[PDB]
Design a protein that fits this description.
Chain B: It is found in: Virion. Chain B: Homotrimer. Interacts with the inner capsid protein VP2. Interacts with the outer capsid glycoprotein VP7. Interacts with the outer capsid protein VP5*. Chain B: Belongs to the rotavirus VP6 family. This is part of a larger assembly, with chains A and B. Chain A is mainly α. In chain A, about 30% of the residues lie in helices and about 0% in strands. Chain A contains two helices and no strands. Chain A is elongated. The two termini of chain A are about 20 Å apart. Chain B starts with a helix and ends with a helix. By secondary structure, chain B is an alpha+beta fold. In chain B, the strands form three sheets. In chain B, strands 3, 4, 5, 6, 7, 10, 11, 12, 13, 14 and 15 form an eleven-stranded mixed β-sheet that branches. Chain B has a two-stranded antiparallel sheet with strand order 1-2. In chain B, strands 8-9 form a two-stranded antiparallel ribbon. Classes of the chains: A mainly alpha, B alpha+beta. At the A-B interface, loops of A face α2 of B. The structure holds zinc ion (ZN). The site of zinc ion has 2 residues of chain B, from loops.
Amino acid sequence: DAGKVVDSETAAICDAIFQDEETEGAVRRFIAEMRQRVQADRNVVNYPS
Amino acid sequence: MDVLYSLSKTLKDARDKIVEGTLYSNVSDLIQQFNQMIITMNGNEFQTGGIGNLPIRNWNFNFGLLGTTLLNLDANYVETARNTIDYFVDFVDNVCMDEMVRESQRNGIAPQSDSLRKLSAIKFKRINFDNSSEYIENWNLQNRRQRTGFTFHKPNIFPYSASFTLNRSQPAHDNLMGTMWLNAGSEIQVAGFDYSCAINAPANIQQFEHIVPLRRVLTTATITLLPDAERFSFPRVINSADGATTWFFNPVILRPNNVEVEFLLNGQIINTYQARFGTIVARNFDTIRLSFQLMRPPNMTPAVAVLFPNAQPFEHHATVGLTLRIESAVCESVLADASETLLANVTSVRQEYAIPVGPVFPPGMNWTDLITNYSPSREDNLQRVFTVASIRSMLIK
Ligand SMILES: [Zn+2]
């Protein structure tokens, strides 16, 4: 779904983990499912890095 | 300890859910757990046994992951997983037998074997799975100081005891008074007697009493009360107090008059029941106080009046008794009972491998000697060993 990461290099790192044939199943399945949390009131955001 | 239960939970589920022909979506989340067991366990090495006749074995883990690409599981996928499960289930047997056999006196709640101390690192914490059993749930609630509870069917709360008490005696032993009792398992049978049948008592009534203290506090018990002690009803000969001589007891049995059963907690009366037989409850208690009395019958037919004269030769002795029995109760410490076999698994390991007597437990794991002096140092060891015996019972019956 619509998920985001924290800047431009942590998207370039996690894309190469998704591609190569060595990473395990619980890590490759995970980075298609990690989520930010916006929470418009209280002004607190969360982004993976 | 928490990761030893988590190894056995997903080896039990791996033999049950990974069957031939099943759909892959039924086992899609177990294989992610079972592959993540293997990644954590590879490269490590272990050593179990060494005490008694328990042999020394070395363990080494180098396995490969399972496939995650079929739609229905076939016989290649089952037979390549059974020869991985059968090595882990042999490892867990020898860790559980290594821990049920050891004990300490300073802090018995800590792990004692070499393998279970090594599994308590933060490297192995990712193997942790759900904790849904009764003993592993009470292991975690009690570790944070929250209130726990074990449910028993006929709990072995009374140590074995069979004795008497003479409130009136002479060396001829022909005019006696007192009580007799048997406390064994979860059953109390007390019986009071009087040879004169209250011929000289004030208002022809003789009062009896029997007080049984417990070792641990029971909660929400279901108790059956019946107005006869069937064990102290026949003629018998009994030795004296110091084993010198023997004395004879020939009973006839009246009904118990004015029965009062009280359920105490720190000397406070929680419950009471007055001439009420059958099934009763007891919400919170640690001391049972039985009270009952003998009354001479004021009207007697000629067949009865010959039995109880006024003079000294009393050939038929009066007897009044009760019978109490705990069906099920909830305690907070571990005990033994009549339904589950956790005490039998602990003693059978120690007897098989010829284990020497240690500093804590009685010789031969005698339950009468263990509930008699049930110290807090023995309670922490007994919970640590019944919990390991509960983990081993999932894999190996
Ligand atoms: Zn039963």
